[PDB]
Amino acid sequence: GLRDTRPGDTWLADRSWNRPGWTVAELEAAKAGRTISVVLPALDEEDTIGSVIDSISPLVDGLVDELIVLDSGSTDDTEIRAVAAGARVVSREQALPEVPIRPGKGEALWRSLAASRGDIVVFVDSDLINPHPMFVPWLVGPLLTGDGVHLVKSFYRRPLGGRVTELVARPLLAALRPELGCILQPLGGEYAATRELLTSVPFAPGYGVEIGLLVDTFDRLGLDAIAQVNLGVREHRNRPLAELGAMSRQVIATLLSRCGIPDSGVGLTQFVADGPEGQSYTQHTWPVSLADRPPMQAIRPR
Amino acid sequence: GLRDTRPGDTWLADRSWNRPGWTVAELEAAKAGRTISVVLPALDEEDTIGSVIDSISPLVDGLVDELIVLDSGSTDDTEIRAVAAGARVVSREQALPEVPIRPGKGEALWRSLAASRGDIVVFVDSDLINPHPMFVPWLVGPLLTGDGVHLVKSFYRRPLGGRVTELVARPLLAALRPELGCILQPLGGEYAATRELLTSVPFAPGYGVEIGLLVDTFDRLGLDAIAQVNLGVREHRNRPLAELGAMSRQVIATLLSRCGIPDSGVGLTQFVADGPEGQSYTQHTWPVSLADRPPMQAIRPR
Ligand SMILES: O=c1ccn([C@@H]2O[C@H](COP(=O)(O)OP(=O)(O)O[C@H]3O[C@H](CO)[C@@H](O)[C@H](O)[C@H]3O)[C@@H](O)[C@H]2O)c(=O)[nH]1
Ligand SMILES: O=c1ccn([C@@H]2O[C@H](COP(=O)(O)OP(=O)(O)O[C@H]3O[C@H](CO)[C@@H](O)[C@H](O)[C@H]3O)[C@@H](O)[C@H]2O)c(=O)[nH]1
Numbered sequence: 001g002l003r004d005t006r007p008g009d010t011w012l013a014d015r016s017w018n019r020p021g022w023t024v025a026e027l028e029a030a031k032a033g034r035t036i037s038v039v040l041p042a043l044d045e046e047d048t049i050g051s052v053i054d055s056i057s058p059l060v061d062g063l064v065d066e067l068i069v070l071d072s073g074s075t076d077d078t079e080i081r082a083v084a085a086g087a088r089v090v091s092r093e094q095a096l097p098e099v100p101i102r103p104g105k106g107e108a109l110w111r112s113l114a115a116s117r118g119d120i121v122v123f124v125d126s127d128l129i130n131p132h133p134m135f136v137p138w139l140v141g142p143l144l145t146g147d148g149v150h151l152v153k154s155f156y157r158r159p160l161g162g163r164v165t166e167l168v169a170r171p172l173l174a175a176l177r178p179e180l181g182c183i184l185q186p187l188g189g190e191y192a193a194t195r196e197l198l199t200s201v202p203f204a205p206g207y208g209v210e211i212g213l214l215v216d217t218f219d220r221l222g223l224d225a226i227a228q229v230n231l232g233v234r235e236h237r238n239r240p241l242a243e244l245g246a247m248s249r250q251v252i253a254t255l256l257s258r259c260g261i262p263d264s265g266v267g268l269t270q271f272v273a274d275g276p277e278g279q280s281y282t283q284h285t286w287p288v289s290l291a292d293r294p295p296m297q298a299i300r301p302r
Numbered sequence: 303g304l305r306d307t308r309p310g311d312t313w314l315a316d317r318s319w320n321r322p323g324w325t326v327a328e329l330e331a332a333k334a335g336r337t338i339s340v341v342l343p344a345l346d347e348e349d350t351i352g353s354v355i356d357s358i359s360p361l362v363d364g365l366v367d368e369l370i371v372l373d374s375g376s377t378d379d380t381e382i383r384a385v386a387a388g389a390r391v392v393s394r395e396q397a398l399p400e401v402p403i404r405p406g407k408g409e410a411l412w413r414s415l416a417a418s419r420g421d422i423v424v425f426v427d428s429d430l431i432n433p434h435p436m437f438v439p440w441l442v443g444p445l446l447t448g449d450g451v452h453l454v455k456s457f458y459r460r461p462l463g464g465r466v467t468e469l470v471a472r473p474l475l476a477a478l479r480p481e482l483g484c485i486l487q488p489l490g491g492e493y494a495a496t497r498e499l500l501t502s503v504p505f506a507p508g509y510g511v512e513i514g515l516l517v518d519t520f521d522r523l524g525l526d527a528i529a530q531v532n533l534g535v536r537e538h539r540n541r542p543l544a545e546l547g548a549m550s551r552q553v554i555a556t557l558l559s560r561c562g563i564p565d566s567g568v569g570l571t572q573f574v575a576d577g578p579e580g581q582s583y584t585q586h587t588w589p590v591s592l593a594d595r596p597p598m599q600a601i602r603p604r
């Protein structure tokens with residue numbers, strides 16, 4: 001199965017693979033009643049976002065019913081450059097105005113549930129350098145085929161998550177939810193899920209949103225509702241070791257909470273070397289949230 | 303305090319620093335009755351070990367009462383090259399013959415308790431490229447000064463643990479034992495402890511030995527028994543991402559166990575890309591142990 005896989009191949013819970021022999025035109029006919037929304041979380045991506053949107057543009061009005069970019073309060077020219085790419089911009093404020101704004105990616109995705117209409121929601125990051133046009137078709141594929149799959153996770157390859165995936169998320173999963181050891185990229189920003197699922201689960205804060213979702217899906221619906229799809233090659237912003245430490249802490253906090261383990265709520269305090277010889281250390285404490293958002297069905301029922 | 307630190311500076315639990323104004327000759331007079339043993343764990347280090355031993359050689363017969371290299375079953379010429387460096391070689395077999403051998407670094411250090419005699423034991427890794435001669439004096443310093451310190455941990459700087467320290471150990475500590483957030487390098491192979499402490503605590507398997515020790519020390523004796531000392535510059539073997547994943551898993555397993563959290567015992571399964579395009583994946587499952595060794599006082603009481 002994993003001895004030969006092509007960009008598009010689907011893996012089911014029961015160690016079974018499937019090669020997709022359809023087109024964008026074929027999947028659209030397999031919809032019938034069900035609608036697809038694509039959401040792009042964005043916090044200052046004025047350089048990359050244009051190219052991201054253009055790859056998805058031809059899908060709109062056909063397969064994709066609506067393309068939405070969720071603005072996490074960008075201070076640069078992201079808001080104006082997204083419109084010029086032919087995308088609809090919805091900020092956190094207008095996505096759900098009657099609930100106060102909280103920082104983090106988890107919020108953005110949670111708020112986008114209220115902002116979107118589609119029966120199926122697809123998330124794609126807006127910092128992707130050259131995304132392949134077939135990304136969205138590949139993610140929706142396993143959902144349109146009737147069997148009871150609610151969450152589609154993607155796996156990718158670095159060109160010629162990263163470290164945090166391989167050292168934090170995956171080993172911790174092996175320790176706490178061993179069944180999810182078959183997930184290759186648990187913290188993948190590119191994934192698709194049905195509204196029925198998304199609106200019934202709580203949404204983890206910050207960078208904990210993905211791993212929270214994965215575990216929540218597995219705990220309620222079992223492994224049989226989760227599928228994996230090969231995308232091929234992924235590339236985005238190169239995060240410094242300092243940032244990765246913070247993200248790890250949030251991934252830990254989110255995963256520990258989903259497993260009924262009390263997390264301290266104490267932020268990761270880092271010690272960055274000042275001078276060349278490491279003569280002194282600058283103390284840096286990243287914030288960590290243990291506050292989930294309630295299932296959207298509790299706030300604004302579809 | 304951390305605004306200006308020199309190689310040798312000691313940090314106490316109560317956020318207090320001390321600059322060591324003594325020599326190797328001065329500390330030796332401050333011993334009186336108490337003895338020091340230095341242990342070097344070694345599993346195939348035939349290139350580095352000679353240089354490691356030579357740095358510690360002049361301390362023997364004076365400050366260091368005995369220098370012991372604990373052989374973890376090296377297949378190369380480590381066993382013969384260690385003797386030629388003027389070091390005493392004790393394998394796992396002869397360190398404690400009446401207990402069957404288990405693989406991993408944790409075993410090596412546990413067995414070395416039975417093999418060593420000193421009231422104070424100092425551990426230094428044998429894969430260190432150019433260790434500073436003052437390493438051992440710096441580690442024993444806070445122990446010889448009477449106040450109730452039982453474990454001395456070192457911090458270092460990369461030249462011009464690594465990732466696992468910063469992404470796994472430290473954030474997880476912040477989550478589970480928040481007080482140990484002030485520890486800079488929790489997985490440091492260079493450290494010193496009193497026999498009274500070492501023989502009363504269980505010894506974690508594999509690369510979990512250090513973090514297990516740190517937590518066990520903190521849980522029983524509190525933060526007041528743990529001190530930190532600057533060493534300056536450290537360098538060793540550059541471990542590939544695959545290995546680091548395994549180590550992380552063991553660090554997690556060990557830390558989770560010390561916190562009364564049940565670990566699955568399921569090994570981390572990794573997916574390494576085969577070809578250039580990542581056309582297929584090779585499945586690789588590292589072993590993980592949840593088996594501590596009992597306190598040495600239970601096996602061979604000093
Ligand atoms: O407060 C925020 C922070 C980020 N983002 C957006 O989310 C996407 C991914 O953010 P990024 O910081 O680049 O994620 P990474 O640091 O690379 O972390 C990786 O792993 C995370 C943990 O699951 C995922 O959330 C990410 O998609 C994935 O890229 C980007 O388009 C951002 O604009 C927001 O909308 N709001
Ligand atoms: O089964 C083993 C494995 C290793 N070692 C020795 O232990 C030392 C450190 O091993 P290494 O694999 O180089 O450690 P790292 O992968 O670099 O891990 C870092 O972080 C670990 C987690 O605490 C510490 O054990 C290490 O000292 C520290 O170098 C070396 O002298 C080895 O010869 C053994 O004696 N037996």
Ligand SMILES: [Mn+2]
Pocket residue numbers: 125127236237
């Ligand atoms: Mn990114």
Ligand SMILES: [Mn+2]
Pocket residue numbers: 427429538539
């Ligand atoms: Mn090493």
